[PDB]
Structures are given as structure tokens and as C-alpha cells.
A = this chain, B = another copy of it.
Amino acid sequence: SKPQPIAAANWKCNGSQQSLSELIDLFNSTSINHDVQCVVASTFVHLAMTKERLSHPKFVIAAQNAIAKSGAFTGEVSLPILKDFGVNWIVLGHSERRAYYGETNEIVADKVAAAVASGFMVIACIGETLQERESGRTAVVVLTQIAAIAKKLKKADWAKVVIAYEPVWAIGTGKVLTPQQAQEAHALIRSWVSSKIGADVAGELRILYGGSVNGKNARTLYQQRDVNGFLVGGASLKPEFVDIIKATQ
């Protein structure tokens, strides 16, 4: 018996107006007759269209990134701009931003804290690389990442936080986690939360699996006890995202 599951679509840097409209239409026509929060994280460009067309009662829209405040930050989008635009969910600290776009543990923590303070529901991403899972220090890496985030939050703030575990070490080497391995990473995270934040928060916290999930593999991943849904990349651009939602039954 778990907290409410989340099925989150990370469209990453993809989509045309037509391909995304067809996806949205599919989502809109889909019966979801169980309790789940579905999330569509579109590009900043596609937020207007997604707001306009996404009408399914079980779906909210999310941004894939942001900075804390408006200002002289050419090219960037701030939390007040998203809030003014009616967007109340955000994915922060994706492994790609940590790798490509200079986001350290602290920068992620600061973005998460600013987003919570501003009233967002936040999917905060953490996860070890292969270099680190090899030196016998998976635990060290992901717990250090979450500690950085926690440092800047109050106990009450965790109600608005969702953790997404990304096994970056698996990313594009064709190799995928066993459900046992996914469970172990999630259990390690929850145990840390129970221990440093509190058993209450830890029981309620959604920890989403953020490795490569598809329509075939989602059900047995969700069966694991500390898995509370998914942050989905590639398959979220496909009709099979509907099967992934159904797998959180």
C-alpha cells in the first residue's frame, strides 16, 4: 500500500506542434480509472499548446527546467514566469543538465528550494554515474545529492517534493537495471529520508524510477515496494506511455 503514484512524461528537447497534438489527443481520450498523477513536461515553447489542448483531469503540465528569478539571464526562463503562465509542476536537476549545463549538487538544491518556496510541485532528480557505481560508492553519490537538496528545505517542504532516481550509469550503454537493483536504490533513498527527515515524510515520499522504462517493463518495476511511478524519457513520446500509466495500478 503506497503513496499516490506519478507517471511523468519527460519529452526532453523534442516535438513539433503536430506530433505533440496527436499525443495529447491520445492522452485526452484515455480512461484512467485509478488514482495516479500524470504529468507532461514539455519544452518551454510547447507549454502554451499543452495548456490549451491537454484536458484530461488526471494530467498536469510541467516545465523541464528553470532559474530562480527574472532578470538579465538571456535565453533562460524563471519560476515567476512559469507561475504567471499557470505552470505549477517542474522537473529539476535532470542528469543531462548536471552533465551538459553546469548544474552542481548545490545549484540543483537552490533551484529546488526556490521552486518549493514559489509554490511548485517539484520532481527533483538524483542518480549515480558508472564511474561512481564502480568505485563502490553508488550510495555516497546519490545520498550526497539528496543531502544537498535537503540542506535547503524544511520538513514541511517535502510534501511538495518528488524524487526521481536516474541510473545515469545505465544511460545509453544498452544495459538496464534489474527490478531488484531499482528497488535497492529506491530503498536506500527512502531509508536516508526516514533517518534524516523523518519516518513520516519517508513513508509519504514518491520516489519515481527514472531509468529506461517502456510499456513492457513498467509493471514489474512498479511492483517493487519503494517505486512510486516513473519519470519517462523516450517512451513518453509514444502511444505506449498509456501502458506505462496503467502499470501504476
Report A89-108 CB contacts with B as 1/0, cut-off 8 Å.
00100111100111000000
How many angstroms from the CA of A43 to the CA of B84 in the assembled complex? 13
The answer on a CB contact under 8 Å between A96 and B77 is no
Nearest Cβ on chain B to A73's Cβ, whole angstroms = 4
- A17: which of B45, B75, B84, B233 is its contact (CB, 8 Å)? B84
Q: Is A179 an interface residue (CB 8 A)?
A: no
Q: A17-B84, A77-B44, A84-B17 are in contact. Are A12 and B101 (CB under 8 A)?
A: no
The answer on a CB contact under 8 Å between B43 and A77 is yes
Interface residues of A (CB under 8 A from B): 10, 12-17, 43-49, 63-65, 67, 70-78, 80-82, 84-85, 91, 94-97, 100-102, 233
The answer on a CB contact under 8 Å between B12 and A85 is no
Q: A13 — which chain B residues lie within 8 A by C-beta?
A: 67, 70-78, 81
How many angstroms from the CA of A199 to the CA of B76 in the assembled complex? 37
Q: A12-B73, A44-B43, A71-B14 are in contact. Are A101 and B102 (CB under 8 A)?
A: yes
| Contacts A/B (CB < 8 Å), 23 sampled | A12-B71, A12-B72, A12-B74, A13-B72, A14-B70, A16-B80, A16-B81, A17-B85, A43-B44, A43-B76, A43-B81, A45-B47, A45-B81, A63-B75, A64-B74, A65-B75, A65-B76, A72-B96, A72-B233, A73-B100, A74-B95, A74-B96, A75-B97
How many angstroms from the CA of A86 to the CA of B16 in the assembled complex? 11
Q: A78 — which chain B residues lie within 8 A by C-beta?
A: 13
Q: A17-B85, A81-B13, A101-B101 are in contact. Are A75 and B48 (CB under 8 A)?
A: no
Q: A102 — which chain B residues lie within 8 A by C-beta?
A: 101-102
Nearest Cβ on chain B to A193's Cβ, whole angstroms = 24
The answer on a CB contact under 8 Å between A81 and B12 is no
Taking CB as reference atom, which chain B residue is nearest A41?
B74
Q: Specify which of A48, A63, A74, A101 lies most central, judged by the most chain B CB atoms within 10 Å of its CB.
A: A74
How many angstroms from the CA of A44 to the CA of B42 in the assembled complex? 12
Taking CB as reference atom, which chain B residue is nearest A96?
B74
Taking CB as reference atom, which chain B residue is nearest A67?
B13
The answer on a CB contact under 8 Å between A10 and B74 is yes
The answer on a CB contact under 8 Å between A74 and B65 is yes
- A45: which of B10, B72, B74, B77 is its contact (CB, 8 Å)? B77
Q: A101 — which chain B residues lie within 8 A by C-beta?
A: 75-76, 101-102
